[PDB]
Structure formats: C-alpha cells, structure tokens
Write an enzyme that holds these catalytic residues in place. Sequence first.
Site, short mmCIF file in Angstrom:
data_model
loop_
_atom_site.label_atom_id
_atom_site.label_comp_id
_atom_site.label_asym_id
_atom_site.label_seq_id
_atom_site.Cartn_x
_atom_site.Cartn_y
_atom_site.Cartn_z
N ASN A 195 8.22 -51.22 53.61
CA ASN A 195 7.87 -49.97 53.82
C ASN A 195 8.74 -48.76 54.09
O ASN A 195 9.92 -50.08 55.01
CB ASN A 195 6.23 -49.50 54.20
CG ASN A 195 6.88 -49.52 56.14
OD1 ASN A 195 8.06 -48.74 56.34
ND2 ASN A 195 6.88 -50.45 56.60
N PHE A 218 7.58 -42.38 59.46
CA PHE A 218 7.16 -42.13 61.08
C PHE A 218 6.25 -40.66 59.94
O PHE A 218 6.63 -39.64 60.56
CB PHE A 218 7.98 -41.49 61.76
CG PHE A 218 8.60 -42.23 62.90
CD1 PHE A 218 7.93 -43.66 62.62
CD2 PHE A 218 9.55 -42.15 63.99
CE1 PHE A 218 7.98 -44.44 63.84
CE2 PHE A 218 9.54 -43.33 64.45
CZ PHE A 218 8.70 -44.28 64.41
N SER A 268 11.84 -48.96 64.96
CA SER A 268 11.89 -48.56 63.48
C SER A 268 12.79 -49.00 62.31
O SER A 268 13.31 -48.06 62.80
CB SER A 268 10.67 -47.42 63.10
OG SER A 268 10.98 -46.90 61.56
N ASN A 312 13.31 -47.21 60.03
CA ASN A 312 13.01 -46.09 58.74
C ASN A 312 13.54 -45.00 59.17
O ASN A 312 13.12 -44.20 59.05
CB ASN A 312 12.15 -46.03 58.08
CG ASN A 312 11.87 -47.53 57.38
OD1 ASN A 312 12.69 -47.60 56.66
ND2 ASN A 312 10.88 -47.83 57.19
N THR A 313 13.33 -44.79 60.90
CA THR A 313 14.46 -43.24 60.73
C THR A 313 15.93 -43.53 61.94
O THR A 313 15.98 -44.09 62.17
CB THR A 313 13.80 -43.26 61.86
OG1 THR A 313 11.76 -42.68 61.63
CG2 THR A 313 14.43 -41.92 62.97
N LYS A 337 8.14 -51.98 72.06
CA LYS A 337 8.47 -52.93 70.15
C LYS A 337 9.89 -53.32 70.38
O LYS A 337 10.41 -52.55 69.83
CB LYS A 337 7.57 -51.86 69.83
CG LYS A 337 7.14 -52.20 68.25
CD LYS A 337 5.94 -52.36 67.88
CE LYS A 337 5.91 -52.97 66.26
NZ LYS A 337 4.77 -52.95 65.33
N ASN A 386 8.80 -55.57 65.76
CA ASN A 386 8.55 -54.80 63.69
C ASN A 386 9.41 -55.40 62.95
O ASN A 386 9.01 -57.12 62.80
CB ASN A 386 9.34 -53.39 64.69
CG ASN A 386 8.96 -51.94 64.11
OD1 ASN A 386 8.63 -52.09 62.75
ND2 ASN A 386 8.96 -51.40 65.09
#
Length: 363
Positions: free
Chosen positions: A113, A117, A183, A185-186, A223, A252
């Site tokens: 994925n 966010f 994450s 993805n940021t 996390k 994660n």
Amino acid sequence: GDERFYAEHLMPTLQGLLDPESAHRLAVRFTSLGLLPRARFQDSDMLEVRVLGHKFRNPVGIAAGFDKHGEAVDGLYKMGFGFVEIGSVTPKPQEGNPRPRVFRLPEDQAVINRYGFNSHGLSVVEHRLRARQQKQAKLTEDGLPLGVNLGKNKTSVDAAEDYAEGVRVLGPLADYLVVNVSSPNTAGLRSLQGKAELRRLLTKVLQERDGLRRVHRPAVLVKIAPDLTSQDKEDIASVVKELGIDGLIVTNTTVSRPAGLQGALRSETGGLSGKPLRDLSTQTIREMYALTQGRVPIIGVGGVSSGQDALEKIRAGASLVQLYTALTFWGPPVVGKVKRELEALLKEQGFGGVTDAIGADHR
Ligand SMILES: COc1cccc(-c2c(F)cc(-n3nnc4c3C(=O)c3ccccc3C4=O)cc2F)c1
Ligand SMILES: Cc1cc2nc3c(=O)[nH]c(=O)nc-3n(C[C@H](O)[C@H](O)[C@H](O)COP(=O)(O)O)c2cc1C
Ligand SMILES: CCCCCCCCCCCC[N+](C)(C)[O-]
Ligand SMILES: O=C(O)c1cc(=O)[nH]c(=O)[nH]1
C-alpha cells in the site's frame, strides 16, 4: 465452519469482484454496521494481559490503518479484538495519494500500500470519538482499550507540532497514543527515527501528554519500521529509555522486497505487509526487547495469521500483538482462530498464560 467458508469461498469471491481499496471500504462499512458473525470464542483468563496501565481481555488487536478515521471501533470489538487502534490521523484532512494505491499479492499472502495518510483529520475524528466517549470508558474498564495513531500532514513544516496537536486533541480520548514515525509513504517521515531529532520530537510529545489532566492522560508509544539499521535501533532504544516512552509498536510495513515474492505486483511502490513481513518483524521485536532489557512493553505486528505467529512474537518479547493483512485473506473468522490457537499452544508449551510467555525466548 465459518473459518473455512470465509477462507475458501467468501473472501476469494470478494477479492475477485472488488479492487482492494473498494473491498476495504466495504469491509469498514459492514464492520461499522455490526454485520459480522459475532465471535463465539469466549476469552479465557489465560489470554488476559496487564500492560500500559490497562487490562487487555485478550492480546490480539487490530493494527492501525484498517479504521483510519475511527468509524468502526465498536464493530471491531464485536469481531473479538482485545483492543483497537485507529488512525493514522493527521491534523488537517488530506486525500492521500492518487489511486490505485493498494495492491494484493495473493501468491505471497501480502499487500502493498501507498495510501499516503488519507485522513478525515483531527477535528472529525475528535467528534466521532466524543460521541461514544463514555461507551469507550466502560469498554476500557472491561478490558477493551482504545489506541489512537497520530500522523503528520504532507505539507507540514514542523513535524513535532503536528504530533503535538494530535496529542492535545485526541490524547484525552485515547488509552494510548502512537507516534508513527515509520510510514514509508510520507516523504522524510521515517528520518524522524534518527536520534537527535527523535529525542526533540518525543520530548515535545511527552511534554504535551504530561500537560493533560490525569484521567485523560494516555500512554505514549513509538511505532517503528522493520527497515532500521542496527545504529537506528540502538539509538531508538536509548532515547525511549532516556525519556520514559511507555512502549513500542514493532513493526510498520517494509519498503524492502524480500527475495521470493511471486505476486505480479511485487514491484509496486509502497509498504509491504503480511506473511513476507512476519519474521522480519519478529526479529525486530527480539532486538528491541533485548536493547530495552525487557522493560519497555512491545506491541508486535507484522504477518500474524495464526496462534503460532502470535506466540512467536510474544516469546520474542511482545506483550500484545496486532494484525491487519490476515483479515484481507481470511476475513473476520481469523481473529477467533488466532486466539483459540494461541490458547492451545500456551497450554502445550507449559505457560500459565500469555504473561508467562512474554520474552520467554530470552530466558
Ligand atoms: C460479511 O463478511 C464480512 C464482514 C466484515 C468484513 C469483511 C471483509 C474483510 F474483512 C476484508 C475484505 N477485504 N478483501 N480484500 C481486501 C479486504 C480488505 O479489507 C483490505 C483492506 C486493506 C487493504 C486491502 C484489502 C483487501 O485487499 C472484505 C470484506 F468484505 C467481510
Ligand atoms: C492498507 C494498510 C494501511 C495501513 N495504514 C497504516 C497507518 O495509517 N498507520 C500505521 O501506523 N500503520 C498502518 N499500516 C500498517 C499496519 O498497522 C501494520 O503495522 C502492518 O500492516 C503489518 O501488520 P500486518 O502484516 O498484519 O498487516 C497499514 C497497513 C496496511 C496494509
Ligand atoms: C526470511 C525473509 C523472507 C521473506 C518473507 C518470507 C515469507 C514466508 C513464506 C510463508 C507464506 C505463505 N504464503 C501463503 C503467504 O505464501
Ligand atoms: O497511509 C499510508 O500509506 C500508510 C501509513 C503507515 O504508517 N503504514 C503503511 O503501510 N501505510
């Protein structure tokens, strides 16, 4: 019965009809409406865990990212989860990345994925949780705690202020908060895991937390990614102990692509979850438990779909576990499955309960 039906018929059919993001939205909707086989598994006393200042009726939680906006919390407890984590929630609403942004790797029982966010934002989630705040107080008292995972906006100039805002707005509604600096993805988010800026960041987060009234004061967890260098892990362990961080969530998704992936979509950008993450996550738990001398509670997450998977993470050092991707392939019955298998294995291996098994591999 239900386990085989979902695993062999319903879930494969849903996947055949719906793209993964659509399937997810449907899943959230059904769950929020209580359209589930209300779990028949009754939690035994040996699954109970006391940690983070709370009782957990069982150690199996839903990981962040399934209920990003706090819409399905009560449905998730109905599914049999011992605790629920919502989020990540960003300060302002934001749409996340363009579609498609989620991909199934069925040959690998994995997902990739890159949501980025997508979030309804703090205000919307605040009002959603306020509408059921006393219901949650009772649930928490009955051993069903609520976690809130905090993110940062894509365009944020000051990451620490984003997290601070989250602590102030949702801290009072949460049993624990998660500072998600992992994450994939940021842009630049993960660099918040480095020592100097992690110490600064977490000092500010804890200050804000400590500023809340006592009955509204949550535990704070960090996390982390599975993709950390040894140096990164040492530094995080040091800072966490120095500052008195209440716990770690490990891990994660991974930006790595382990050898052997078969899915056609294996080279899509994003974080990989599910079974190819499982042992990478378990080893990260093992390392973080050792580096923190077993004094820092760990919530273990990554590729859990069986009681064996759960117990391996518990014996590695996790006090609690979470799952997400297993739901995509097994559906709701997987929660009862994991709990039943975990109870059976604890008995087989001579543990009086989950608590006795935590960190057992290190002893
Ligand atoms: C009536 O029975 C019920 C009751 C409650 C929930 C469900 C259900 C469920 F649990 C998972 C899915 N599902 N299928 N494929 C996927 C998902 C995700 O949730 C998902 C999520 C995130 C990324 C990817 C995916 C993904 O690829 C579909 C459902 F209908 C079924
Ligand atoms: C579609 C998807 C969305 C996710 N969103 C978040 C998120 O917003 N915040 C977060 O901390 N983790 C998020 N995660 C990571 C999960 O919480 C979990 O750490 C990871 O998926 C490993 O567990 P699993 O293998 O059981 O899925 C997401 C995972 C997936 C698959
Ligand atoms: C040691 C790192 C290797 C990468 C991850 C390994 C995945 C283990 C394979 C078991 C998964 C079974 N399945 C159905 C999901 O394909
Ligand atoms: O929103 C996302 O892309 C996301 C956030 C996170 O923390 N982990 C993940 O795999 N995806």
